[PDB]
């Protein structure tokens, strides 16, 4: 299974800094990365970066190197294999050119060559 409910689709104006939430269920939140993907209207879809709900190790594209704060809090065990978690997304020197739909997607596998690959996506959120 797996679900990743995202935050609201509210809008602000340039210069600000917004927070996007992603709430997970039905899967062990710590066993897969959490990716942030952006589908702007005036650019091809961009991979922003992934983060580890277990190791805390984050990795973003150099286009977002010093402009994004990715944070996740610890999970809440529901069963032996089910937990609930959350992931957060931020932008610093923000303008109105960063407009589009934002998604959160968890990793594919736990090991191998396609560990972090965005496999399970959220419903997306509309921006400014």
């Amino acid at each position: 299974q797996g679900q990743l409910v995202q935050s609201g689709a509210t809008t602000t104006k340039p210069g600000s800094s917004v927070k996007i939430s992603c709430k997970t269920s039905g899967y062990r939140f710590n066993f897969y990365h959490i990716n942030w993907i952006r589908q702007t209207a005036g650019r091809g879809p961009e991979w922003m970066g992934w983060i580890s709900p277990y190791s805390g190790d984050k990795n973003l594209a150099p286009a977002f190197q010093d402009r994004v704060n990715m944070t996740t809090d610890t999970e809440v065990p529901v069963t032996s294999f089910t937990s609930t978690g959350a992931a957060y997304m931020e932008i610093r020197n923000l303008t109105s050119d960063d407009t589009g739909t934002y998604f959160c997607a968890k990793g594919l596998l736990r090991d191998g060559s396609s560990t972090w690959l965005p496999y399970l996506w959220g419903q997306g959120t509309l921006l400014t």
């Binding site: 032996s80 294999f81 596998l109 736990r110 090991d111 191998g112 396609s114 560990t115």
Partner: protein, 133 residues
């Protein structure tokens, strides 16, 4: 290196735990379990001793009637019926843990144990028919 210890990779992937099988193999019969006094602690310990050797040989007996005597990883000729689990390899050995894998394969575990049992009775009958020349 790593050496997670006894059952250390219980939360790891099935492929990673499949490299530390001797860790759990050697701890199936030793532990700490010299006269036999029949006290409340003595009858207790005597039971803990006999139970351990019983469950150890039941596994080694099944390992024998499948042609896997003294093996940690033996391969068979029984092919994987997809109705057991249609999951792919890369989403099992790099994804699932042995605990949840046993949770979903538990239904067909008695079916698989029969297919390996006669495949070994027929393989040793073929090996005799081949060395008859």
């Amino acid at each position: 290196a790593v050496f997670l210890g006894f059952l250390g990779a219980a939360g790891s992937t099935m492929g990673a735990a499949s490299m530390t099988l001797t860790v759990q193999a050697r701890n199936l019969l030793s532990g700490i379990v010299h006269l036999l006094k029949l006290t409340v602690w003595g009858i207790k310990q005597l039971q803990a001793r006999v139970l351990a050797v019983e469950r150890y040989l039941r596994d080694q007996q099944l390992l024998g009637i499948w042609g896997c005597s003294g093996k940690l990883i033996c391969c068979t000729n029984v092919p994987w019926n997809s109705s057991w689990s249609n999951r792919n390899l890369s989403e099992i050995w790099d994804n699932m843990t042995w605990l949840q894998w046993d949770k979903e394969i538990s239904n067909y575990t008695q079916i698989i144990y029969g297919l390996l049992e006669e495949s070994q009775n027929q393989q040793e009958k073929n090996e005799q028919d081949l060395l008859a020349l």
